[PDB]
Structures are given as C-alpha cells and as structure tokens.
Amino acid sequence: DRLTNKFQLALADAQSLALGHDNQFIEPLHLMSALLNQEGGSVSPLLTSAGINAGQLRTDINQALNRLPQVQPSQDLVRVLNLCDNVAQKRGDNFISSELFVLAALESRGTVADILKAAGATTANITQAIEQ
Question: Where are residues bearing N6-acetyllysine located in the sequence?
Fold first, then answer.
C-alpha cells in the first residue's frame, strides 16, 4: 500500500505475534509490540526522543497482550491504520511510516492509547518527535 516497507514488515510480525500468543485478532497492541521489537525500527528511537521509556513500554504492552482472549486484523487495527493514512495525508508524507502509528494509536482510545498516555505520550511530544 502506501505503507513503508518497514511498516509492512512490522505488520507481518504483528500477525505472527497474534498467532504465537493464540489471539484471534491482530490488535493495535500487537502492531506496537512488533514495532518496539523492530531492530533499526523508527518507533523505539521516536519514543526515546519524546522522553518515553521504550523499555517499560514493551513490558506494559506485553502485559496487555497477556490479558487478551485466546483461542485476522481486528477492526480496532483497521481503524487505527485508517487514521495513520489520514495523518500521513495531513502531514504531507508520501508514505505512511511507523512513527505515525504511535500518534494515531494515541488518538484512537482503547488499551494502547491508555498505556501510551500513562507512559507520558501526548499528541504534542509525539508530533514533535515525528517532525524532528
């Protein structure tokens, strides 16, 4: 799609994570976990730059993943990805990058947004990190 190759690869990993954890749906949480674990990925350094502890974030995200029902993208994920698209359009980006997911997730309510807020993420410090 309009997604960067790195973002597409993280999505594939998110699917593997959902499968490996016996979850029926790939949730924004799965995508986030994948992005946090992506060597050379943009998400971890973006968070560190925004003043958010990426290490503790993956722990809280893993805790949330551990709470999901066990038994394929969820509508939650489709929704957040749609906002990523809109955000890329508003910022004038040619493609949808991983950093936008952090911003879109923060503005999409639900568990991931709650975790990000508690971790110190705000539309302001994430947007600043993105522009930087």
Answer: 86
